Structure 1
Amino acid sequence: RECISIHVGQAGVQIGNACWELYCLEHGIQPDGQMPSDKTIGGGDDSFNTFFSETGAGKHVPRAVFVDLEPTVIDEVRTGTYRQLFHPEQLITGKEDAANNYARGHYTIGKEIIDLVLDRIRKLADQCTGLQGFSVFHSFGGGTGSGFTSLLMERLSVDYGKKSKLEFSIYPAPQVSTAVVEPYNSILTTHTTLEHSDCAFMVDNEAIYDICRRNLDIERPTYTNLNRLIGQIVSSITASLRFDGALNVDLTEFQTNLVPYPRAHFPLATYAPVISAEKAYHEQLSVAEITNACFEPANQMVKCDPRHGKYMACCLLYRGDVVPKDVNAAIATIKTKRTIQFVDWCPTGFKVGINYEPPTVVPGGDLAKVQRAVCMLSNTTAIAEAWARLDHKFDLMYAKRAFVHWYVGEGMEEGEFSEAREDMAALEKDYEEVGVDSV
């Protein structure tokens, strides 16, 4: 039940330290080092409070990797709400960053920093033998982003054998973005890091924008809100490993439950019973509306019609915390009468999973006390349009050969961009060939 996470990019380190602060606040891992529930300093390793290692004389540290070439991000992290108990010996950063592109950080200037973080990965890999994949935080154009990942996934799949891993791809939002060439780095990231992967799921910042401004009636699009929401969502995801309950199955069980194919690889994370100080005051929580409000279009990370969205799988995650009795009542109150449009020639068995021992809600945030979780990790074969729109914009901007000259002299060629277009066209046309329902 042991895993060590790496984080690259500025927004990657932001969601990383936000989620780790939420972890340390909800396990009682105080900034005093020890957890006051027992008498073990630093942390613990018993069954599920197992995000630590015996570094000192029982001293335990929240093992994670924070990497970005731009050096001030780790300084502004280290002066945050969890100040001094981050690692004083592995916070490795560069001097000058790639500054919002792909090619320079990957091929040219990162080639003398890949081996340093590789040696750090080896030194942390000489530690405790628990291994159930990885947890890689990255974006498409936030910090270095694609530049580290496009090399390190190949390096992990060649150097470290055929070991499983998992990654976090932050899907961008042009209304709050900071670049224009995001189709190019998106298509390059999608042909590179997905074919050398084992598990992934894409989170859209525009989906957060939609569920905030269009579903919660708040008026603040700042990355702190995104960091807190990602902390909540990834905490709910990891809470199966973090707390033991009735169906306390591992993340290896999840990744050997979800993925059907190397190409058919991505879920539609369905968790929008949206909450804040507004939508948590004097409401009533039930197992009907939070489960009936899943398949609708304005609840999704990636946009899809419910009838046009075909569920190859309909896996579910529950935070539980009261009983499994009402969950096994809602398996007939909601889950049994589901004749919703499905995929042909595949089993139609709905899955549920409940994990007890409540993760504590965010302190000092916006949401009030909430109980349930409807993190229904389905998948959708009609997310081919969600990248076909980017391929269409990339076609309408790529025939003009815009921004090519910044991506010529750093090693690649026009054949690489043709191969990236070929790979995304292959993925999409494979979905309308056999992914979307066929004969």
Structure 2
Amino acid sequence: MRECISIHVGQAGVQIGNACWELYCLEHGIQPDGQMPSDKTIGGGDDSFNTFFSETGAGKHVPRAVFVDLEPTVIDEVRTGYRQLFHPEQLITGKEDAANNYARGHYTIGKEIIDLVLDRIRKLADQCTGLQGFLVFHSFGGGTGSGFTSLLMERLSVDYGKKSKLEFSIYPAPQVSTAVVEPYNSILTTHTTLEHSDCAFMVDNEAIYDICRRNLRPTYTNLNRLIGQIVSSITASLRFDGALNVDLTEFQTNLVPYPRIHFPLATYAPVISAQLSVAEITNACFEPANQMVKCDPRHGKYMACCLLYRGDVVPKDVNAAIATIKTKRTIQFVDWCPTGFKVGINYQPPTVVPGGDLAKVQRAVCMLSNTTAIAEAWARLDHKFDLMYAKRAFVHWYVGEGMEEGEFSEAREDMAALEKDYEEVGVD
């Protein structure tokens, strides 16, 4: 009765989406060719995976996925190494990359391809009768994943204004960065997609790299597998039995109070090399060094918490873990009915990749918590933006695609307003 259309923009979006759909086929027991051993006896939908997976006339469980990128290498990689799983009609390729430029993907190169992607989006939405919205997979640093994401968000806000759109962004990291103007692209795509995004799970690769270094350099494959595990356990509640956060409106209402403050934080305890009590893994979800954003939540104030447990976790000791967490004076909630840890428990254990990077575990916990500690990350990004705009460095690569000079000052004013609003939330 409900459908979701996943959208992947950029090389990072395409690779993350392929890993995530592989893990979704692994967790739900769907065969890689598209058939299902057990659940295909009915042959119909609404079997708790109809929010993501669509069934054709031949019984194939093709995912409702759109892979868009301006480079066809990763698209052909998905089409070769999967091919019968993803239809070639919904996989849109491009000719020329935007090449780490926001304005190239937003004004010239993405504008020649935005209409075909919109037509494919409408064609995939015609099969959906009760669709909720879209999951945008992109990355902040790239040229496609910022410019085409911003133009896509503008088009989906004009044309699909009654729907709510998520966001799955990749925050740039100095450990693995292929460009220098990632602050410029990130600030511009934050200012453009501020009013068009309702939940942005921005995760930086520095935290994933540090987790892979200290628990598991690790390459992009290990980072992709860990990020796919993180996103799969984030969206485990949407593809399973209903406890909480099973809808996009639930995500938008349990964590996002403001029209602009829609940046949650995820934290994951059970990262072990390929036992552990509930209290310590609940305590490890509050550790600042295990978060998916490199920031300190103890200097900020929480706004919400949606603890999602996976595996055979008894719900009796979860409340005792909650009490032992709340006895500590580290967490300082807001002072207008802050509620608490809205725990929902799914009894299906999470499945890991056979011989991959994460071992199979019985107790898994994720902490979808909003805070004001993301303002430190935005202050870092605006400090890098202000350092490269005092002397107008790298400016001409954007003005040559039709972008004006005042767009950078507008994005700086928008980021100053975002920092001021985060401070005003943080000040009673």
TM-score class, shorter? over 0.9
Cα 1:179–1:257, aligned 2, differ >3 Å: closer, same or farther?
same
**Within 1, Cα distance between the matches of 2:175 and 2:115?**
36
The answer to whether the aligner puts 1:300 opposite 2:301 as a matched pair is: no
Scaled by the length of structure 2, what TM-score is found?
0.93
Match of 1:262 among 244, 259, 268: 259
Deviates more, 1:18-27 or 1:386-395: 386-395
What is the Cα deviation at residue 234 of structure 1?
1.0
Give the 3 Å change call, closer, same or farther, for CA 252–372 of structure 1 in structure 2.
Answer: farther
- Secondary structure (helix, strand or coil) at the match of 1:242 reads coil
- Whether the 8 Å contact between 1:102 and 1:146 is mirrored in structure 2 is yes
Change (3 A) 1:9 1:332: same
In the TM superposition, what whole-angstrom CA distance separates every residue of 1:371-408 from its partner, at most 9, and x where no partner exists? 22221111121321211122122212211111111111
Listed one character per residue, the Cα deviations across residues 232-257 of structure 1 (whole Å, up to 9, x for unaligned) are 11111111122216557434322221
Q: Is the 8 Å Cα contact of residues 248 and 354 (structure 1) preserved in structure 2?
A: no
For residues 149 and 84 of structure 2, what CA distance do their matches in structure 1 show?
28
Q: Distance in 1 between matches of 2:303 and 2:236?
A: 24
Report the RMSD for the aligned CA atoms in angstroms. Answer: 2.3
For the 8 Å contact 2:75–2:91, the answer to whether it is kept is: yes
Which digits, 9 at most, give the CA deviation of each residue in 1:86-135, with x for residues without a partner?
A: 11322121222222221112101221210001000111111121322211
8 A Cα contact 1:321 1:358, kept in partner:
yes
Question: How big is the shift at 1:40?
Answer: 4.3
Task: Give the number of aligned pairs.
Answer: 427
Contact kept, 8 Å, 1:6 with 1:135, in 2: the verdict is yes
Q: CA deviation at 1:50?
A: 4.4
Distance 1:248 1:188 in 2: 30
Instruction: Report deviation, 1:322.
Output: 4.3
Percent of residue pairs bearing the same amino acid type: 99
What residue in structure 2 maps to residue 54 of structure 1? 55
1:428 deviation in Å?
Answer: 0.5
C-alpha separation in 2, matches of 1:270 and 1:138? 20
Q: 397-406 or 71-80, which moves further after superposition?
A: 71-80
Which stretch of the first structure deviates more once superposed, 341-350 or 291-300? 341-350
Pick which of 207-216 and 149-158 moved more.
207-216
Change (3 A) 1:43 1:275: farther
The 10-residue stretch of structure 1 (422-431 or 138-147) with the greater mean CA deviation from structure 2: 138-147
In 1, distance between residues paired with 2:176 and 2:199?
27
More strand per residue: 2
Gaps of 5+ in 2: none
Answer yes or no: is the 8 Å Cα contact 1:317–1:374 preserved in 2. yes
**What is the CA–CA distance in structure 2 between the aligned matches of 1:102 and 1:10, rounded to whole Å?**
15
Whether the 8 Å contact between 1:134 and 1:165 is mirrored in structure 2 is yes
- Larger mean Cα displacement after TM superposition, 34-43 or 128-137: 34-43
The aligned counterpart of 1:125 is 125
Distance 1:338 1:2 in 2: 42
Q: CA deviation at 1:264?
A: 2.0
Q: Which runs of 5+ in 1 are unaligned?
A: 279-284
Counterpart-to-counterpart distance in 1, 2:327 and 2:347: 23
Residue 171 of structure 1 pairs with residue 152 of structure 2: no
